[PDB]
Ligand binder design. Structure first.
Ligand SMILES: [Mg+2]
Ligand SMILES: [Mg+2]
Ligand SMILES: [Mg+2]
Ligand SMILES: [Mg+2]
Ligand SMILES: [Mg+2]
Ligand SMILES: [Mg+2]
Ligand SMILES: [Mg+2]
Ligand SMILES: [Mg+2]
Ligand SMILES: [Mg+2]
Ligand SMILES: [Mg+2]
Lengths: 62, 46, 362
RNA sequence: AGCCAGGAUGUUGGCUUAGAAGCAGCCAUCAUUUAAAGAAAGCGUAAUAGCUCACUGGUCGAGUCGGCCUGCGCGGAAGAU
RNA sequence: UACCCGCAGAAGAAGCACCGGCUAACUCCGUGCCAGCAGCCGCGGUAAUACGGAGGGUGCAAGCGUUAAUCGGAAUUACUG
RNA sequence: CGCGGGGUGGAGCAGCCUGGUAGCUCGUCGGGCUCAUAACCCGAAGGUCGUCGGUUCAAAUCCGGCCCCCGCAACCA
RNA sequence: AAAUG
């Protein structure tokens, strides 16, 4: 299949073991899946402070 | 960074030209706010 | 002496710019580490390494040395400027001027080498402009670009020649090929290869909407067409043998058929059309030559294919400039240099972009 | 012809080169201390270094050197009962 | 063990989603069809309550979101209808 | 290798037929037509006749050489 | 007579 990569910037490349979750992208032809940010080889999105759950971003400890 | 997967297959002569004749470098036409293709059924916040 | 002062002022600025582009501190550091490596007596035991390191060192040293020379010379000139002005000693002033000139020349030389370090940079080029997906608007944009390029080339002293022009059915051009002859023509233009972004309200659109149209420039140097070299009989195996089916008494005996084989490559050409062996060989020879030529062409093509594939890999990065006419601002995406004089740029003030690009090395 | 000795100085001539110190070349090819010593003929080096040579001093004590002309020979010269 | 009594001191103990419309909750800055968002409709091309951050708010709460899964809405297989 | 035919602007064709003369269709350029493009209308330009020699006063044209193309023929054992 | 944007 083909799966969308949400968020600004990703560490992904060839032979990268990833988790996909489902959910189709209306714009993209044939895309039926979203990759899960913050699971397996896929990293969380950098510098996010809101909606972090969706993007695998840990709590900014202060 | 990520590679762009062009819809040109196997480029033989010139890459730039091929890219130009691709969806990547398609024309972007603004939708009118006033004038011709200007009518909005529902507003952005309505 | 006001012009001299102005020149002095300029020179420091350009030196600073050069340093910025070079990344001077890093270079200095590299030179230092390499120097340290050099004096260690164990490094000359490995010969291949050592020569390479030496090669690396020298250029770096030159870069560094020239840079501070520039820093010092300017300062000296400034010091002597005062003397020229207030004390009114003429000979000293003249000397200072001479020194400045020398320094300027040196700077130019350094910048020259930084710029035109590539192999084909001195040669003349074919600039190829192609209109995009837009339509009439795109064609117009392409035409505009072509015009701009022509203006630029005339400006510095290059000879333009419109080789091929495909004209737009409504307005502008569909495609154009321009031969640009002159000293370091390709080196000056090679940076302009890429897709150009026009943003303006279309005059050809009936609605009058603001369009984002694209058009590609493609600069390639006029390579010298190498002579197709004569293959040596040492590289060749010539077999002679009897023909298939044949048909007669003299045919059964005679070995007219010729098999020519290239030893380095492994290509074969057979010929048995003629009765005469010699004639067959000649024909076979010709065939072999043709095959070799074809192989050469194929190899050339394959390499070329690799190159663009790599170029394709950059994708959206082939977009080099953005010509916004509505907000009145031109931006080079590669360097980051911006100007609000859009009309001036269109007329042919590309020097500001081009030079910076060259300095960058992109 | 052997044999024993020296075979230097300015000097590593500059340049262009990654380096070039007789020997990568490009080019000049000088003068010096003089018995004689090429800004170098070969080997050698990352390049120097190093090892030879040219010419010269000493020993030794009679012929010697290499061109020309010709005579006769040698190699070049491998095949199938 | 449950349970009860005493001891000390606010002490050791709050997050998650969302805020264009559906759908409860809006502004400023940053970005400029880019980056990105999105369940649908669509948002973004230099004043974005739709992107990202902040302040303010709303809903849930030791959970809160996302995905998958079934029924519902869907009278959209209608026996009722 | 032999016998023929050819090479004439961007293109495709003529003329070469007994040497002096450069034509047709399309294309190119400038107008006009349309809101614009196409079509259509008007007006122009553009050829060292593959190349090198030869002979007539004179060569696209005749003759020869060379380069390129297209046919044909390249056979009997 | 009259094709297209
Ligand atoms: Mg003999
Ligand atoms: Mg509301
Ligand atoms: Mg804003
Ligand atoms: Mg929303
Ligand atoms: Mg937002
Ligand atoms: Mg039902
Ligand atoms: Mg023709
Ligand atoms: Mg006639
Ligand atoms: Mg017209
Ligand atoms: Mg005539």
């Amino acid at each position: 299949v083909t799966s969308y990569i949400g968020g600004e910037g990703h560490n992904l490349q060839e032979h990268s073991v990833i988790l996909i979750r489902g959910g189709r992208v209306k714009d993209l032809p044939g895309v039926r899946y979203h990759t899960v940010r913050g699971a397996l080889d896929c990293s969380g999105v950098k510098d996010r402070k809101q909606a972090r759950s969706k993007y695998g971003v840990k709590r900014p400890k202060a | 960074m990520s590679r762009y997967q062009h819809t040109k297959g196997q480029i033989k002569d010139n890459a730039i030209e091929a890219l130009l004749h691709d969806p990547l470098f398609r024309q972007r036409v603004e939708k009118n706010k006033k004038g011709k293709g200007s009518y909005m059924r529902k507003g952005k916040h309505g | 002496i006001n012009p001299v002062n102005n020149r002095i002022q300029d020179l420091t600025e350009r030196s600073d710019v050069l340093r910025g582009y070079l990344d001077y501190d890093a270079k200095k550091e590299r030179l230092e580490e390499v120097n340290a490596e050099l004096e260690q007596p164990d490094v000359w035991n490995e010969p291949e390494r050592a020569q390479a390191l030496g090669k690396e060192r020298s250029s770096l040293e030159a870069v560094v040395d020239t840079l501070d020379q520039m820093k010092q010379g300017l300062e000296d000139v400034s010091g002597l400027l005062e003397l020229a002005v207030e004390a009114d000693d003429e000979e000293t002033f003249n000397e200072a001027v001479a020194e400045l000139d020398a320094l300027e020349e040196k700077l130019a030389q350094l910048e020259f080498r930084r710029m035109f370090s590539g192999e084909y940079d001195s040669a003349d080029c074919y600039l190829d402009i192609q209109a995009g997906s837009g339509g009439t608007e795109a064609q117009d944009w392409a035409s505009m670009l072509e015009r701009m390029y022509l203006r630029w080339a005339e400006s510095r002293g290059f000879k333009t020649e419109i080789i091929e022009e495909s004209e737009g059915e409504v307005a502008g051009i569909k495609s154009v090929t321009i031969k640009i002859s002159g000293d370091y023509a390709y080196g000056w233009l090679r940076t302009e290869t890429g897709v150009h972004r026009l943003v303006r309200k279309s005059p050809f659109d009936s609605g009058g909407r603001r369009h984002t149209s694209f058009s590609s420039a493609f600069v390639y140097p006029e390579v010298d067409d190498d002579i197709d070299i004569e293959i040596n009989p040492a590289d060749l195996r010539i077999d002679v043998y009897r023909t298939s089916g044949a048909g007669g008494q003299h045919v059964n005996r005679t070995e007219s058929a010729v098999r020519i084989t290239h030893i380095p490559t492994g290509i074969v050409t057979q010929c048995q059309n003629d009765r005469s062996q010699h004639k067959n060989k000649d024909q076979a020879m010709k065939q072999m030559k043709a095959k070799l030529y074809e192989l050469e062409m194929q190899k050339k093509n394959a390499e070329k294919q690799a190159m663009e594939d790599n170029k394709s890999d950059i994708g959206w990065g082939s977009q080099i400039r953005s010509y916004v006419l509505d907000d009145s601002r031109i931006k080079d995406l590669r360097t980051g240099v911006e100007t609000r004089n859009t009309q001036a740029v269109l007329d042919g003030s590309l020097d500001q972009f081009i030079e910076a690009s060259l300095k960058a090395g992109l």
